[PDB]
Write a protein that binds this ligand. Structure first.
Ligand SMILES: Nc1ncnc2c1ncn2[C@@H]1O[C@H](COP(=O)(O)OP(=O)(O)OP(=O)(O)O)[C@@H](O)[C@H]1O
Ligand SMILES: Nc1ncnc2c1ncn2[C@@H]1O[C@H](COP(=O)(O)OP(=O)(O)O)[C@@H](O)[C@H]1O
Ligand SMILES: [Mg+2]
Ligand SMILES: [Mg+2]
Lengths: 523, 290, 521
């Protein structure tokens, strides 16, 4: 111990010297291996016949595959989409002004692929992998194809774990399990993104509290949006902290039409990494209705014959190829999961459109947001009569399965009586009860913008609204009473309902004793 | 253990852990062990990659063993620092900096036909304040000729550029003609000696100015970090430094089986020995078994 | 000899042959593909080239890739060796349990049987669902349709039909999953493992169902032909072995949709709303093979998706003419909470003649329909005025029809997961007696909510007296449980001391797992 040496004490300590030696020890036997097996492969060429509108018709390229990435001599990439007898139709990944007639097209040999892995977490990429946030290359990442076959029947198991969004209009009435795809459909400026941003921010609040295995890693695919709209979301995910778990795949409105068509598949491939390796993913395709317009543009410029409204025939297969990749895998495959939230924008509340009726037919649930409910104050503007969840009571919170069964049972009774009592004919002292109680529940399911409520403070609030504790409280401050119902009620009763997951008989008698020692406004 | 390309680079090394590995290898050799064969293999790219990753293992304990002359008076500590970096480069297998960066220029420009691709492909090694000043002069002679200035030397379409590029070089502050006369040489040694003695004054000016710019940037970074650090309260400082130290320990403790991880934790334990040994006798320093 | 791929545009592949073109509907196999790619010849394009549709994805196809004619259509294994297995469109097993035993594999393309070999015999299929058994009774051997939009309950009703009529009946069953969700196909498979209808491993021979699955991830070539593969398994069980087959086809709409997705790539100018010019003949060529013949019988239950709750769309309106019993499920019935949401007026059957199901069934079904119809004619004035004038017989019409509307609802044995309730099987005589009671003023003493989600008319009486016992005993807990309890409710710090803490790592372990898998494989 004492009196080491002089030659032992002359060493500089935290120099690299051995990380350098580790790199040179792992590198030189690997690069002699590369040079001893190195054939420079034959590159098949092609001439550009014509070019325009982001399509280049290419002569030659006779061994090119369908869906294969090709490279122009301008540096701009492409994808061979329709192989014809005389030419190749190549959609161009970028500006087609740099491609000329007679330019050389080289085939890369490879189908379109994106870098997947945990090195994509935190980063903002474009429609194919390449990061656009100005933070260098994607370290710790691995390429894989964007068009992967979805897991079949034997590769799944039933959707049973709950996905908490933190939006109590969703987590009570239309609950969402892990592996379930749920459509957020609505009109132009409803709360569609705000439902999906709240589902992502809430996973940050749950990831700090759950063990490492059941953490949900979110991917937000932004198709056809503004570039400053998605810069407002990277700023929001940074100052909340959700960007630690979030990948953003950003194919904005100035990107080429094949980059916006392919960005939901790139984001699904970045999120299928967590599904395939036993973790849990959450993919949000913001405006699939803007991906199909990008698909219609290529299909009409590749001269594929138009169908309904102008859309190609295979536009159902466009979205069902993509949404069926959201699955809850079997325990042999890891038990991993991927939960999808496609967003579809309708025009005037017209869900009978082409792309709208396709994705309604694909996804399990539906979160239908209404612009007339938005302006009545009800925000999230969820149409509780039209919003479904096909998983339903299978994968919701057991503490709110026994409370929100009563909640939708009463709100179904609220709806038809208010259609009659707005004429002002007569009222019946129990018909008076259901349109006075359903107003307590409608104000209960309102929420602010970026504050997801965990799951236990949601079920205590619907408990206090359905077990009568919020009767004789005025309707204007039920949105203001329920902060007192969460703050003044003891913070250790939220731990028991989080740990049990259920209202035990030894807890309802304690909680309804605690919902009486609260000072409610108005009263 | 060393792999005999490890130890041939460490024969002229003078840092501690290279010299003890050399001495252990020679004490292995004296006790009846044969040398292994030298690899006459690994064609030129692998040989360059190996000397690149073997110069760094001589440079990296040598850079850490050179005291920076921060906050010093006079150019003689800057000349000490630059001469120590010169000696470390010579021990690691580099040449003179002039010869080495000229070799880098000639390696990056073996394909060069025009002066435009010369000034665009050696951009990573020439400063922007000189590359832009040569680009505007190339454009000035290109506006004269209305034909691309080519990299020939005997073509006077190049020489109309080069006579103004020498003016740019003398307006930067560096004497170009004594540099050209040094690397062109002469016949008689008495007339080449008087220009080598001027080139070496330029060279000492240049490497002292480079080492001084590096030292002033390190001083500015240290003063910026300190003035950002003296704005915090003390408990914030303690929990920040303790959190960073704990994370950097756990990143080397989750590495198990890597040589750098065992060396990292062994150096942490040696630092703790240094602290205990100056706690045992603070007037005498650490205990050195001499 | 063989042919070669000439053109790949989407899922539609042109193959060029140099002599001896394959027949139309012959299957071709691309060699050199990553997966087994089967093309099916759709038409002869004319200069020694045929146009094909692919049964898998065409990503990775190269012009000039060699294509082998098999000389026959798509041939799938049929027989008892398929009972308990899941097949593709092309007969490959997708359940990861060995190969399929394949006694006498069969082509999936056939003509409809004939006109001479039809059976004109009508007997009722009792299903347990009282709205089905009452108002549109199913024929034992005929084609049943389940119509409705998205989310009305076609899959729940077809699952209740599966475990109500398929768990014990005289022959075999074939489920053809056509272009629906993979999640519910897995749910159906696991439910039939648990229900003992499909047995795995050594008892595979005692299985009573074949699954043939063609789900939404599959290209439009596969979703257009998987219904034919389920048909071929059922046609082997009917034609060769001469026994009764149940054939459940979830979403026969997807067959028409999948044919429409390739149609304009096959060189067809588009028809009405977006469909192919050959919509009615494609649908008819499928539907006319699902027949009871003189050899056996196939009782078909097909779900039909309507696109925007729109029964005037040509894909449901074409298939309406093919079904002996069309159960139409409505969104309006589902938003009331009446489940099964069967539209009582819109659901028709050919078994609703009095000389087929008797007069005591026919007249109660027609009376229930008349009461539910003039209630709908009153309902536009109830929503405005509010039962203040309604003449003491139309008030009785509204009350009896609300009792009927609740009494058509029934808790399903497969919907115990959804709401809360154990499922009810209702016999035919029980629902005849019950609706004849409600129709003839016999049960006006009960609340109308005692009819909601009950088995039969004795469970209405078993729920009415429960409601009375309950709402007359609301006043039991207004005096206790507020203080001085039994201390079976312990203190809160005691309850949070039982919360055994889960360790939280704060490392996320991701970048080590990635390099662990990078040093793996
Ligand atoms: N729960 C909410 N409470 C209050 N305001 C909300 C809520 N949700 C959304 N908003 C407001 O509504 C506006 C529209 O929200 P959002 O951006 O989600 O619209 P959108 O449905 O995504 O439509 P688009 O895609 O056209 O932007 C936002 O400015 C937001 O401030
Ligand atoms: N008999 C029923 N009882 C309770 N709920 C039902 C019933 N039938 C349908 N539902 C509800 O309707 C939802 C959608 O039904 P589903 O089976 O998906 O029909 P489809 O396949 O036509 O969309 C289900 O999640 C379920 O909650
Ligand atoms: Mg938006
Ligand atoms: Mg369905």
């Amino acid at each position: 111990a004492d009196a080491k040496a002089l030659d032992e004490l002359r060493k500089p300590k935290f120099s690299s010297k051995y990380l350098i030696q580790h790199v040179s020890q792992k590198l030189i036997p690997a690069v002699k291996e590369w040079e001893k097996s190195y054939q420079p492969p034959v590159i098949h060429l092609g001439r550009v016949l014509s070019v325009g509108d982001g399509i280049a018709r290419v002569y030659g390229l006779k061994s090119v595959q369908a869906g294969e990435l090709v490279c122009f001599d301008s540096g701009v990439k492409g994808m061979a989409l329709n192989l014809q007898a005389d030419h190749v139709g190549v959609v161009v990944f970028g500006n087609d002004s740099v491609i000329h007639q007679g330019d050389l097209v080289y085939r890369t040999g490879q189908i379109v692929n994106v870098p997947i892995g945990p090195g994509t977490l935190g980063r903002v990429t474009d429609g194919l992998g390449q990061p656009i946030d100005g933070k260098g290359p994607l370290t710790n990442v691995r390429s894989s194809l964007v068009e992967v076959k979805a897991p079949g029947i034997i590769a799944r198991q039933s959707v049973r774990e709950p996905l908490f969004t933190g939006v109590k209009a969703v987590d009570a009435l239309v609950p969402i399990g892990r592996g379930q795809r749920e459509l957020i459909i609505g009109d132009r400026q409803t709360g569609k993104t705000a439902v999906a941003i709240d589902a992502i921010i809430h996973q940050k609040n749950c990831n700090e509290q759950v063990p490492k295995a059941q953490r949900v890693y979110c991917v937000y695919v932004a198709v056809g949006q503004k570039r400053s709209t998605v810069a407002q979301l990277v700023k929001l995910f940074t100052q909340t902290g959700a960007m630690r778990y979030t990948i953003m795949v950003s194919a904005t409105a100035s990107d080429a039409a094949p980059l916006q068509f392919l960005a939901p598949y790139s984001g699904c491939a970045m999120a299928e990494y967590f599904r395939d390796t036993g973790k849990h993913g959450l993919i949000i395709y913001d405006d699939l209705s803007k991906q199909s317009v990008a698909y219609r543009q290529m299909s009409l410029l590749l001269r594929r014959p138009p169908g309904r409204e102008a859309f190609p025939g295979d536009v159902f297969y466009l979205h069902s190829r993509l949404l069926e990749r959201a699955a809850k895998l079997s325990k042999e495959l890891g038990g991993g999961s991927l939960t999808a939230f496609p967003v579809i924008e309708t025009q005037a509340g017209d869900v009978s459109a082409y792309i709208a009726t396709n994705v309604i037919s694909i996804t399990d649930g539906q979160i239908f947001l209404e612009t007339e409910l938005f302006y009545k104050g009800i925000r999230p503007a969820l149409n509780v009569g039209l919003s479904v969840s096909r998983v339903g009571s299978a994968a919701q919170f057991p503490g709110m399965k026994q409370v929100a069964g009563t909640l939708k049972l009463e709100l179904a009774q609220y709806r038809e009586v208010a259609a009659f009592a707005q004429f002002g004919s007569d009222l019946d002292a129990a018909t008076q009860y259901v349109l006075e109680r359903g107003a307590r529940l409608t104000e209960m399911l309102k929420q602010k913008q970026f504050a997801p409520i965990p799951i236990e403070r949601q079920t205590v609030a619907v408990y206090a609204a359905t077990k009568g504790f919020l009767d004789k409280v005025r309707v204007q401050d039920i949105v203001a009473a329920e902060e007192a119902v969460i703050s003044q009620v003891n913070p250790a009763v939220f731990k028991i309902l989080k740990a049990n997951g259920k209202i035990t008989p030894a807890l309802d008698a304690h909680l309804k004793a605690e919902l009486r020692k609260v000072k409610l406004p108005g009263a | 253990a060393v792999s005999k390309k490890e130890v041939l680079y460490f024969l002229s090394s003078k840092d501690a852990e290279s010299s003890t590995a050399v001495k252990s290898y020679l004490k292995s050799l004296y006790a009846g062990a044969q040398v292994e064969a030298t690899e006459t293999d690994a064609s030129e790219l692998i040989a360059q990659l190996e000397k690149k990753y073997l110069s760094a293992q001589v440079v990296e304990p040598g850079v850490h063993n050179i005291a920076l002359p921060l906050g010093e008076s006079g150019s003689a500590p800057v000349k000490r620092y630059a001469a120590e970096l010169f000696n470390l480069g010579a021990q690691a297998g580099f040449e003179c900096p002039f010869i080495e960066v000229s070799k880098k220029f000639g390696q990056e420009t073996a394909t060069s036909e025009t002066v435009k691709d010369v000034l665009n492909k050696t951009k990573s090694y020439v400063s922007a304040d000189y590359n832009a000043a040569l680009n505007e002069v190339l454009s000035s002679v290109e506006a004269e000729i209305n034909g691309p200035v080519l990299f020939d030397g005997k073509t006077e379409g190049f020489k109309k550029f080069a006579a103004k590029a020498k003016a740019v070089a003398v307006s930067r502050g560096l004497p170009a003609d004594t540099i050209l006369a040094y690397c062109a040489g002469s016949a008689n040694e008495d007339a080449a000696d008087k220009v080598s003695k001027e080139f070496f004054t330029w060279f000492e000016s240049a490497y002292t100015a480079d080492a001084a710019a590096e030292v002033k940037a390190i001083e500015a970074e240290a003063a910026s970090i300190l003035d950002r650090h003296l704005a915090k309260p003390v408990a914030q400082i303690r929990k920040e430094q303790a959190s960073a130290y704990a994370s950097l320990l756990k990143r080397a403790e989750t590495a198990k089986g890597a040589k750098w991880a065992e060396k990292y934790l062994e150096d942490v334990k040696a630092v703790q020995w240094f602290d205990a040994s100056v706690a045992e006798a603070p007037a005498s320093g650490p205990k050195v078994a001499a | 000899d063989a042919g070669y791929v000439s053109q790949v545009i989407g899922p539609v592949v042109d193959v060029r042959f140099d002599g001896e073109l394959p027949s139309i509907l012959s299957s071709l196999e691309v060699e050199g593909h990553s997966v087994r790619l089967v093309l099916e010849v759709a038409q002869h394009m004319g200069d020694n080239t045929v146009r094909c549709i692919a049964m898998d994805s065409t990503d990775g196809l190269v012009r000039g890739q060699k294509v082998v004619d098999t000389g026959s259509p798509i041939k799938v294994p049929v027989g008892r060796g398929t009972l308990g297995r899941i097949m593709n469109v092309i007969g490959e097993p997708v359940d990861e349990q060995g190969p399929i035993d394949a006694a006498d594999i069969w082509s999936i393309h056939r003509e409809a049987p004939e006109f001479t070999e039809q059976s004109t015999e009508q007997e009722i299929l009792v299903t347990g669902i009282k709205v089905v058994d009452l108002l549109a009774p199913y024929q034992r051997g005929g084609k049943i349709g389940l119509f409705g939009g998205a989310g009305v309950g076609k899959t729940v009703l077809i699952m209740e039909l599966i475990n109500n009529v398929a768990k014990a009946h005289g022959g075999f069953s074939v489920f053809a999953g056509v272009g629906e969700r993979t999640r519910e196909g897995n749910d159906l498979y696991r439910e039939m493992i648990e229900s003992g209808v499909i047995k795995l491993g050594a008892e595979r021979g005692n299985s009573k169902c074949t699954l043939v699955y063609g789900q939404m991830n599959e290209p439009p070539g596969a979703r257009a032909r998987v219904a034919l593969t389920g048909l071929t398994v059922a046609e082997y069980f009917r034609d060769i072995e001469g026994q009764d087959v149940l054939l459940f086809v979830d979403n026969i709409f997807r067959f028409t949709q999948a044919n429409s997705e390739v149609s304009a790539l096959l060189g067809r100018i588009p028809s009405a709303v977006g469909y192919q010019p050959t919509l009615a003949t494609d649908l008819g060529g499928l539907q006319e093979r699902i027949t009871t013949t003189t050899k056996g019988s196939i009782t078909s239950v097909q779900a039909v998706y309507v696109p925007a709750d729109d029964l005037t769309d040509p894909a449901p309106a074409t298939t309406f003419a093919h079904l002996d019993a069309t159960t139409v499920l409505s969104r309006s019935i589902a938003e009331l909470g009446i489940y099964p949401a069967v539209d009582p007026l819109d659901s028709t059957s050919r078994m609703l003649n009095p000389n087929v199901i008797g007069a005591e069934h026919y007249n109660v079904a027609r009376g229930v329909q008349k009461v539910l119809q003039d209630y709908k004619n009153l309902q536009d004035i109830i929503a405005i005025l509010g039962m203040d004038e309604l003449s003491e017989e139309d008030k009785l019409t509204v009350a009896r029809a609300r009792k009927i509307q609740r009494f058509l609802s029934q808790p399903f044995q497969v919907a115990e997961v959804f709401t809360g309730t154990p499922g009810k099987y209702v016999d035919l005589a029980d629902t005849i007696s019950g609706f004849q009671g409600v129709l003839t003023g016999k049960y006006d003493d009960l609340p109308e909510m005692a009819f909601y989600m009950v088995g039969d008319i004795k469970e209405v009486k078993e729920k009415a007296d429960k409601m009375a016992k309950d709402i007359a005993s609301r006043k039991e807990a207004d005096n206790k449980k507020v203080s001085e309890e039994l201390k079976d409710i312990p203190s809160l710090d005691k309850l949070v001391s039982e919360i055994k803490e889960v360790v939280i790592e704060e490392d996320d372990g991701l970048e080590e797992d990635f390099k662990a898998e990078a040093l793996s494989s």
